[PDB]
Each structure stands twice: as structure tokens, then as C-alpha cells.
Write a protein that holds these residues in place. Structure first.
Motif, PDB file in Angstrom:
ATOM      1  N   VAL A   1       0.845  -1.188   0.000  1.00 51.14           N
ATOM      2  CA  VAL A   1       0.000   0.000   0.000  1.00 51.14           C
ATOM      3  C   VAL A   1       0.878   1.234   0.000  1.00 51.14           C
ATOM      4  O   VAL A   1       1.805   1.337   0.812  1.00 51.14           O
TER       5      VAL A   1
ATOM      6  N   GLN B   1       0.895   5.025   0.853  1.00 51.68           N
ATOM      7  CA  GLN B   1       0.188   5.975   1.701  1.00 51.68           C
ATOM      8  C   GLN B   1       0.828   7.348   1.566  1.00 51.68           C
ATOM      9  O   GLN B   1       2.041   7.483   1.716  1.00 51.68           O
TER      10      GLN B   1
ATOM     11  N   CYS C   1      -4.462   6.107   0.235  1.00 53.46           N
ATOM     12  CA  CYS C   1      -3.785   4.837   0.158  1.00 53.46           C
ATOM     13  C   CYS C   1      -4.158   4.172  -1.154  1.00 53.46           C
ATOM     14  O   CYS C   1      -5.323   4.159  -1.543  1.00 53.46           O
TER      15      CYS C   1
ATOM     16  N   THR D   1     -11.051  -2.349   3.814  1.00 50.35           N
ATOM     17  CA  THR D   1     -10.094  -1.397   4.329  1.00 50.35           C
ATOM     18  C   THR D   1     -10.341  -1.103   5.809  1.00 50.35           C
ATOM     19  O   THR D   1     -11.463  -1.248   6.306  1.00 50.35           O
TER      20      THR D   1
ATOM     21  N   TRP E   1      -8.790   1.790   8.997  1.00 50.78           N
ATOM     22  CA  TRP E   1      -7.979   2.944   9.362  1.00 50.78           C
ATOM     23  C   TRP E   1      -7.735   2.938  10.869  1.00 50.78           C
ATOM     24  O   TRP E   1      -8.650   2.616  11.672  1.00 50.78           O
TER      25      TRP E   1
ATOM     26  N   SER F   1      -7.813   2.598  -4.960  1.00 46.87           N
ATOM     27  CA  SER F   1      -7.370   3.562  -3.977  1.00 46.87           C
ATOM     28  C   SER F   1      -8.489   3.807  -2.993  1.00 46.87           C
ATOM     29  O   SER F   1      -9.657   3.734  -3.358  1.00 46.87           O
TER      30      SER F   1
ATOM     31  N   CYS G   1      -3.399   2.960   7.276  1.00 45.74           N
ATOM     32  CA  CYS G   1      -4.441   2.280   6.521  1.00 45.74           C
ATOM     33  C   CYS G   1      -4.074   0.810   6.286  1.00 45.74           C
ATOM     34  O   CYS G   1      -2.921   0.495   6.087  1.00 45.74           O
TER      35      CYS G   1
ATOM     36  N   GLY H   1      -0.121   0.702   4.872  1.00 42.28           N
ATOM     37  CA  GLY H   1       0.641   1.889   4.472  1.00 42.28           C
ATOM     38  C   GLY H   1       1.764   2.202   5.442  1.00 42.28           C
ATOM     39  O   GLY H   1       1.797   1.683   6.564  1.00 42.28           O
TER      40      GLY H   1
END
Length: 111
Positions: free
Chosen positions: A3, A5, A22, A34, A36, A65, A83, A103
Motif C-alpha cells: 500500500v 500511503q 492509500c 479497508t 484505518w 485507492s 491504513c 501503508g
């Protein structure tokens, strides 16, 4: 797979917004989900961010993305943001059955 970021380091003033991007790179299929995370400056605990309120997520499968936008930045938003993208090595052809990549992080300083 990995990833990308961006931005990796940024400083913002209170009341401004941040968008973190990301993008899942070097993988033959889309991402499956995903997540976070936030560790507030000063602290050592990683919290999972619930999307809602001042946090907004936009996933654009196509560029593969996903982006996080934080509105009305507070001083207590300072911290490191990460992420995670879940994906299947086999594009799910092999039953179930997943891995994740994360990321490099974004070090945010508010004000």
C-alpha cells in the motif's frame, strides 16, 4: 502487494481538513476491505477508526485507492495514521482466505 500511503508527514492548522490517500499496488485484483487506525501523539495505543462523524472514507475501486478525510482538525487529532487493505493472494480462487498490507503511515501534527 503493498500500500502506498500519502502524505507521509504533514502539519495542519486547527479547523483545516486532511485527506490521506492509500493505493494498493502490485496486485492482480481489487482490495476486499479497508481499515484505518490512529495512535494519538503522546500515546502508545492504536485505535481503530470508525467511519462516521468527522471521518469520511472514499473507496475508488478502479484506481484501487481508498482515502480518509478528517474535517475540522483538532489539536488532539495529532498522531500517526495507518491504513490496512485486505486482499486474497489468489484473488479468492483459493478458498476463503486472506492477507493484509498496510501503508507506511502519516504523521499528522495539528497546529
Amino acid at each position: 502487494a503493498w500500500v502506498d500511503q500519502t502524505p507521509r508527514t504533514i502539519t495542519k492548522e486547527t479547523g483545516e481538513s486532511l485527506t490521506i490517500k492509500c493505493v494498493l499496488k502490485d496486485h492482480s485484483c481489487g482490495l476486499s476491505s479497508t481499515t484505518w487506525y490512529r495512535t494519538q501523539l503522546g500515546s502508545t495505543n492504536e485505535k481503530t477508526i470508525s467511519i462516521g462523524g468527522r471521518y469520511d472514507e472514499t473507496v475508488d475501486k478502479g484506481s484501487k485507492s481508498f482515502s480518509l478525510r478528517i474535517s475540522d482538525l483538532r489539536v488532539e487529532d495529532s498522531g500517526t495514521y495507518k491504513c490496512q487493505a485486505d486482499y486474497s493472494p489468489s484473488c479468492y480462487s483459493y478458498p476463503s482466505l486472506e492477507s493484509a498490507v498496510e501503508g507506511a503511515g502519516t504523521v499528522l501534527t495539528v497546529k
